[PDB]
Nucleic acid binder design. Structure first.
Ligand SMILES: [Cl-]
Ligand SMILES: [Cl-]
Ligand SMILES: [Cl-]
Ligand SMILES: [Cl-]
Ligand SMILES: [K+]
Ligand SMILES: [Mg+2]
Ligand SMILES: [Mg+2]
Ligand SMILES: [Mg+2]
Ligand SMILES: [Mg+2]
Ligand SMILES: [Mg+2]
Ligand SMILES: [Mg+2]
Ligand SMILES: [Mg+2]
Ligand SMILES: [Mg+2]
Ligand SMILES: [Mg+2]
Ligand SMILES: [Mg+2]
Ligand SMILES: [Mg+2]
Ligand SMILES: [Mg+2]
Ligand SMILES: [Mg+2]
Ligand SMILES: [Mg+2]
Ligand code: NA
Ligand code: NA
Ligand code: NA
Ligand code: NA
Ligand code: NA
Ligand code: NA
Ligand code: NA
Ligand code: NA
Ligand SMILES: [Sr+2]
Ligand SMILES: [Sr+2]
Ligand SMILES: [Sr+2]
Ligand SMILES: [Sr+2]
Ligand SMILES: [Sr+2]
Ligand SMILES: [Sr+2]
Ligand SMILES: [Sr+2]
Ligand SMILES: [Sr+2]
Ligand SMILES: [Sr+2]
Ligand SMILES: [Sr+2]
Ligand SMILES: [Sr+2]
Ligand SMILES: [Sr+2]
Ligand SMILES: [Sr+2]
Ligand SMILES: [Sr+2]
Ligand SMILES: [Sr+2]
Lengths: 237, 56, 92, 194
RNA sequence: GCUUUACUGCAGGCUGUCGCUGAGGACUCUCACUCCGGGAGGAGGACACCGAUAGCCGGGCA
RNA sequence: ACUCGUACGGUCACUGAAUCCUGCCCAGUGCAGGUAUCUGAACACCUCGUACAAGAGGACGAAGGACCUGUCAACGGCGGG
RNA sequence: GAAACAUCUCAGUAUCGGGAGGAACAGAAAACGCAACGUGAUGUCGUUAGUAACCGCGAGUGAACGCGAUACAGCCCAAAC
């Protein structure tokens, strides 16, 4: 047959690429040596094309103008601090060791100094729970208990733009506009609506898959479609 | 719209032009590569054994 | 059918009639050192292996008699042409 | 009596034993951070180098080359192929890693000609070989009664034509009798059956 | 051309084993190696990656 | 490549606005988890064999399979008497 | 081609990448093994011979030593000191 859509993706052609040239900034945490004496004033609140959530423009003491991942409540004029001895106020970035337990946190690092990996999407947050000299247990937005290094930096507060998922797209055109700002091919044609040559579920006189949908993990690209290594399917039971 | 005569009307794009190296009208002005002598692609002149019958 | 374990018959080794003992030919174990074994290892590579990719055929509904006729005095055996028998049981 | 050279030779008979085991463990850390072809002022194996034709003279260059370990880096067939020709994984190249190393060295130095090469070890993913190259145009070599043969026009690109030592061995030309029916005088004259 | 529990194979995935690979049937360490850090340094660690082989799955492909 | 992206994410599929609803079946097939025991390759190891080697057998036993469980908005099924 | 076809065959052919010369390559035995009290660098030509050898032992595939010729040419390092 012909290569399936998921295989065309990997080649990284224009249709599948993200409009990177239209993106604003790669929202990472600032680099401090030690001492904490790095603070800044919020100049503007901009829209970020990459994540459909707002981003805050901050001007630091040493003359550095950088866009930061905006938590909720952060406005123009507000002073944000980045470092070890930073104040435990929403919008400040300090390592997990210095942040008290039971406090909602965002833009958490995986490895110390990476700039932030977890809890970055609209309105989500990570929850810092247990402390130790070796481990800081953080509960990520998926409900997973992630054991991290207490030296991993994070920003206090929930991410801004909460409740975006609450309002329906209503029409196809609204989806179109959102998708044009992302690295995704849209609309989605069902495999079951294609020809046998194009997809494992293609063909037939009527529309239905040709085999069961639950495919093995060991399946090769071109065959790994439908329900990938499903532990279970359905709602009931 | 038919693929024949009505689709021929849009053909006013210049691609293949006179080559600086070989003199043939095969220098693709968009690719900046010659389809005849390989100018723009290789220092060595484009030649292939299939351009003639195997035992010749 | 029934077959006597011991009976009088011709011995081609003794050149006279002696009491023979009948035994079913037990399959001798393979050494894996014959030419065909070395050819299987040599000729098998990438893709199909021709004859070495074939899997052993079926069975005939009834197999022929596979027996050894052992002489009672000289102790040497001889083979005979087998006959189709669904079962072969020995008497004594 | 024994030469000092004989001790470099004896050390290299077992590169995983003695002081050499520790030396290689150290050196390879620096080598892995080095390039594909690195010119070195002095050979790692003096005995082997001198034995192969090296001289501490002007116009004699040495270079360490790293080539990857393993079989062929082959692409799977994109058209109709019979089962025998459908392989990817078990296919190995006909030229040995030493020969690949020599060619990569000769490309880096377009004016020089390959004299010989030798192995200087390997790790888990690559092999290192040091290639002795010669300047056919330097008068220091053109007047050398032992090396001036390499100056001749027919010795141009000698490595790319298999005229090198590792070339001739890889071409199956070692034996003068039985087994070399399809190798001598050339692989091509014998219909590529060697 | 297309399908599959047709024949035979080929990619790919999973898994054991050998090499890289080191010190004191479960374990400790650090020095290779990997990743994070601008750096200092941190995490991991003889595993993983990679090379080789073996078993299983394998119309994704021939 | 996705990705100047991080689960309110994005990948892979099915169904196809709203409204009222979406029953029963896990035996087969698929996927997934488990597993006393069974089966399960090669390397190393043990026995035999060979002044060596081929080779024969053993011990151990990974994934996988047997076996057990979960799962149908998973492939599907919902009859005769 | 094998009157299908998978090994085999077409064939190391077509085609592709790299490179030298006026010719290339080969070449002074860790050779041969008409086993010898024998030959004596290498190409090549004739022959050895469709012989030995390979092969779903099918179709097909296929040398060499030697011999008669052509032309003839033997040397330089590394190390010892
Ligand atoms: Cl979306
Ligand atoms: Cl019988
Ligand atoms: Cl060269
Ligand atoms: Cl002779
Ligand atoms: K064929
Ligand atoms: Mg960012
Ligand atoms: Mg787009
Ligand atoms: Mg659709
Ligand atoms: Mg259709
Ligand atoms: Mg298909
Ligand atoms: Mg329908
Ligand atoms: Mg349907
Ligand atoms: Mg020739
Ligand atoms: Mg990196
Ligand atoms: Mg097919
Ligand atoms: Mg035919
Ligand atoms: Mg036939
Ligand atoms: Mg042939
Ligand atoms: Mg011979
Ligand atoms: Na062989
Ligand atoms: Na060169
Ligand atoms: Na050969
Ligand atoms: Na067709
Ligand atoms: Na069922
Ligand atoms: Na035919
Ligand atoms: Na046919
Ligand atoms: Na054959
Ligand atoms: Sr980043
Ligand atoms: Sr960075
Ligand atoms: Sr279908
Ligand atoms: Sr239900
Ligand atoms: Sr019209
Ligand atoms: Sr136009
Ligand atoms: Sr170009
Ligand atoms: Sr050409
Ligand atoms: Sr073979
Ligand atoms: Sr095979
Ligand atoms: Sr039968
Ligand atoms: Sr050249
Ligand atoms: Sr509806
Ligand atoms: Sr089931
Ligand atoms: Sr002579």
């Amino acid at each position: 047959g012909r290569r399936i859509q998921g295989q065309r993706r990997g080649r990284g052609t224009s249709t599948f690429r993200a409009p990177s040239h239209r993106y604003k900034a790669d929202l990472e945490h600032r680099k401090v040596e030690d001492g904490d004496v790095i603070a800044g004033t919020v100049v503007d609140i901009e829209h970020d094309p990459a994540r459909s959530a707002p981003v805050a423009a901050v001007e630091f003491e040493d003359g550095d103008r950088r866009l930061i991942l905006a938590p909720e409540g952060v406005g123009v004029g507000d002073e944000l601090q980045v470092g070890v001895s930073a104040e435990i106020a929403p919008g400040n970035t300090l390592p997990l060791a210095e942040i008290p337990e039971g406090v909602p946190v965002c833009n958490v690092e995986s490895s110390p100094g990476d700039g932030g990996k977890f809890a970055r999407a609209s309105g989500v947050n990570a929850q810092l729970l247990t402390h130790d000299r070796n481990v800081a247990v953080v509960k990520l937005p998926s409900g997973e208990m992630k054991r991290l290094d207490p030296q991993c930096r994070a920003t206090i507060g929930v991410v801004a733009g909460g409740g975006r998922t609450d309002k329906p797209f209503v029409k196809a055109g609204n989806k179109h506009h959102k998708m044009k700002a992302r690295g995704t091919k849209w609309p989605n044609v069902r495999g079951v609506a294609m020809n046998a040559v194009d997809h494992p579920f293609g063909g037939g006189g009527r529309q239905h898959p040709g085999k069961p949908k639950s495919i093995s993990r060991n399946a090769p690209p071109g065959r790994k479609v439908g329900d990938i290594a499903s532990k279970r399917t359905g709602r009931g039971g | 719209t038919g693929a024949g005569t009505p689709s021929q009307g849009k053909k006013n794009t210049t691609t293949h032009t006179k080559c600086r190296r070989c003199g043939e009208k095969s220098y693709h002005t968009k690719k900046k590569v010659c389809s005849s002598c390989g100018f723009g692609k290789s220092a060595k002149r484009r030649d292939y054994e299939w351009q003639s019958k195997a035992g010749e | 059918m029934q077959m006597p374990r011991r009976f009088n018959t011709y011995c081609p080794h003794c050149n006279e009639h002696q009491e023979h003992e009948v035994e079913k030919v037990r399959s001798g174990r393979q050494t894996g050192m014959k030419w065909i074994d070395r050819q299987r290892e040599r000729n098998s590579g990438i893709g199909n292996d021709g004859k070495f990719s074939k899997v052993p055929g079926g069975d005939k509904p009834t197999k022929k008699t596979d027996l050894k006729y052992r002489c009672g005095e000289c102790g040497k055996a001889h083979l005979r042409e087998g006959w189709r028998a669904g079962r072969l049981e020995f008497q004594e | 009596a024994r030469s000092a050279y004989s001790y470099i030779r004896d050390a290299w008979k077992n590169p995983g034993d003695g002081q050499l085991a520790e030396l290689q463990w150290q050196r390879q850390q620096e080598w892995r951070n080095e390039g594909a072809v690195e010119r070195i002022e002095r050979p790692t194996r003096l005995d082997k180098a001198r034995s192969q034709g090296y001289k501490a003279k002007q116009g004699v260059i040495v270079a360490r080359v790293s080539v990857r370990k393993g079989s062929a880096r082959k692409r799977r067939h994109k058209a109709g192929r019979r089962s025998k020709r459908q392989g990817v994984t078990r296919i190995t190249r006909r030229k040995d890693i030493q020969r690949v190393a020599e060619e990569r060295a000769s490309r880096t130095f377009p004016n020089l000609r390959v004299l010989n090469s030798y192995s200087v070890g390997q790790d888990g993913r690559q092999k290192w070989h040091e290639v002795i190259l010669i300047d056919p145009n330097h008068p220091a070599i053109q007047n050398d009664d032992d090396l001036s043969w390499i100056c001749a026009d027919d010795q141009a690109d000698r490595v790319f034509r298999g005229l090198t030592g590792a070339g001739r061995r890889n071409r199956g030309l070692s034996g003068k009798g039985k087994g070399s029916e399809k190798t001598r005088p050339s692989l091509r004259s014998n219909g590529g059956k060697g």
